[PDB]
Design a protein around this ligand. Sequence first.
Ligand SMILES: *[C@@H]1O[C@H](CO)[C@@H](O[C@@H]2O[C@H](CO)[C@@H](O[C@@H]3O[C@H](CO[C@H]4O[C@H](CO)[C@@H](O)[C@H](O[C@H]5O[C@H](CO)[C@@H](O)[C@H](O)[C@@H]5O)[C@@H]4O)[C@@H](O)[C@H](O)[C@@H]3O)[C@H](O)[C@H]2NC(C)=O)[C@H](O)[C@H]1NC(C)=O
Ligand SMILES: *[C@@H]1O[C@H](CO)[C@@H](O)[C@H](O)[C@H]1NC(C)=O
Ligand SMILES: *[C@@H]1O[C@H](CO)[C@@H](O)[C@H](O)[C@H]1NC(C)=O
Ligand SMILES: *[C@@H]1O[C@H](CO)[C@@H](O)[C@H](O)[C@H]1NC(C)=O
Ligand SMILES: *[C@H]1O[C@H](CO)[C@@H](O)[C@H](O)[C@@H]1O
Length: 310
Amino acid sequence: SGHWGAWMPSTISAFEGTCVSIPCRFDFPDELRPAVVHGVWYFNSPNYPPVVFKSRTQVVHESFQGRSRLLGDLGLRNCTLLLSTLSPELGGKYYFRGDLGGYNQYTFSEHSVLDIVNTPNIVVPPEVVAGTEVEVSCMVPDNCPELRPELSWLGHEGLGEPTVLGRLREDEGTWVQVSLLHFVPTREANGHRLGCQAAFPNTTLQFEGYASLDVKYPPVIVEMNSSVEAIEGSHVSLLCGADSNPPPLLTWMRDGMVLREAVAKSLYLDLEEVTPGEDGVYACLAENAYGQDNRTVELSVMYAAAAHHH
Ligand SMILES: *[C@@H]1O[C@H](CO)[C@@H](O[C@@H]2O[C@H](CO)[C@@H](O[C@@H]3O[C@H](CO[C@H]4O[C@H](CO)[C@@H](O)[C@H](O[C@H]5O[C@H](CO)[C@@H](O)[C@H](O)[C@@H]5O)[C@@H]4O)[C@@H](O)[C@H](O)[C@@H]3O)[C@H](O)[C@H]2NC(C)=O)[C@H](O)[C@H]1NC(C)=O
Ligand SMILES: *[C@@H]1O[C@H](CO)[C@@H](O)[C@H](O)[C@H]1NC(C)=O
Ligand SMILES: *[C@@H]1O[C@H](CO)[C@@H](O)[C@H](O)[C@H]1NC(C)=O
Ligand SMILES: *[C@@H]1O[C@H](CO)[C@@H](O)[C@H](O)[C@H]1NC(C)=O
Ligand SMILES: *[C@H]1O[C@H](CO)[C@@H](O)[C@H](O)[C@@H]1O
């Protein structure tokens, strides 16, 4: 109580070409009773930081000229800063310095890191599995009073209609715009391109961000031979194809014995000089981390080989 100190969000973000208001409050010993309260805003991009604002001499660095103005009264312990027409160069650390005349100048420790962005924020859970309810969100910074972002999805036709949460508060007292997608994805939703757009009315500013859904799903054996009727002594190739994400482990088996095994989309089982001893049921097993599938095929050597003398 009645102490040198400041209060501002450690981090804050805004769209390139827009504005940002950095909420700021500072305090000082009440015993001072200054007739006039002065202040200085400094900028550190990565020992001579450019001056954003300085009430004393009204000096403004060229990078901030006509792009920065102090909001709120310093006499009311309110050092809120507005930065306008933002460009990537303005990204960095901002800190405030109090000046109550005499030797009562004070550079406050707490600062604010401004992040300037050009794409909306799409949040997708690290593991998306088919058959489970999934939430996807588009987040957008909302710290510009003069310009409000309109949020919209791109290529969301198969995922259902969005649910707009609106302006939400995050930590440090900053704001975001959030829109949601709640859906149960099938295997078809794998690779689906998801896009979000942040547009500002009465401007030409339009920001787009895209992401691709990685949908995991169990194997479905889609390629499989029908009942094989082979010629004596011929060559027989059995093919088992499987569709899964991630790619499946394919296993050819007969009589409880693994004939061939490989992590692939398709797996061939080659039988040479086919004899009646090769007759029987062959099984193809497909499995990944999310499920399994299996089919069988009966091999029948029912065609006698013709003699071959020339
Ligand atoms: C330190 O000083 C700073 C600056 O002096 C103070 O910050 C200001 O505080 C005042 C309150 O004293 C605020 O003024 C209020 O603003 C409210 C804003 O809400 C409406 O107005 C907007 C107009 O641009 C409008 O966008 C908004 O949303 C509408 O549009 C959206 C899309 O267009 C849509 O999503 C919405 O649903 C809605 O339709 C609202 O309608 C307003 O409601 C109040 O009546 C009052 O005017 C300033 O905005 C603050 N300025 C800044 C830069 O933050 C700060 O409080 C001081 N600190 C202390 C401790 O005193
Ligand atoms: C946006 O509207 C403001 C007033 O609300 C006006 O000053 C400005 O010129 C407009 N910008 C454009 C590009 O029309
Ligand atoms: C099984 O099917 C694959 C692909 O359709 C084919 O290449 C292969 O020759 C077939 N096997 C037999 C014995 O016909
Ligand atoms: C093959 O799949 C069926 C269900 O599709 C299952 O009941 C059976 O146990 C599976 N067989 C093997 C060997 O995994
Ligand atoms: C600011 O200056 C020093 C900082 O410790 C103290 O005398 C006191 O906190 C004052 O507010």
